[PDB]
């Protein structure tokens, strides 16, 4: 008898545009040292 392993797969999720929408329509970035 013997055992055979299939393998290991990693999840590759996607993303959405947030840098040009969330920081442009909701909040405004302004540096103030």
């Amino acid at each position: 008898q013997f055992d055979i392993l299939l393998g290991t797969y990693c999840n590759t999720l996607n993303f959405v545009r947030f840098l040009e929408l969330g920081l442009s329509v909701a909040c405004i970035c302004t540096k103030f040292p």
Binding site: F2, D3, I4, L5, L6, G7, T8, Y9, C10
Partner: protein, 65 residues
């Protein structure tokens, strides 16, 4: 997947035929069997399938929207 009288009632009520012909591509994939599999099986007994992380025909059908 629908059948029986449920399919008939669906097509009578809300489902309408849009397409008549469709094609299905054929894709076959064979894994590599050349390497250290034979020696590792004869010295150990078990095998591990690695190499997973580095870094036509016309058949009628009906489609609804």
């Amino acid at each position: 997947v629908t059948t029986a009288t449920l399919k008939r009632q669906l097509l009578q009520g809300i489902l309408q035929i849009d397409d008549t012909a469709a094609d299905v591509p054929v894709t076959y994939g064979e894994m590599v069997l050349q390497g250290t599999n034979l020696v590792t099986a004869l010295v150990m007994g078990k095998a591990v399938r690695g190499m997973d992380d580095v870094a036509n025909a016309r058949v009628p059908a009906d489609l609804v929207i």
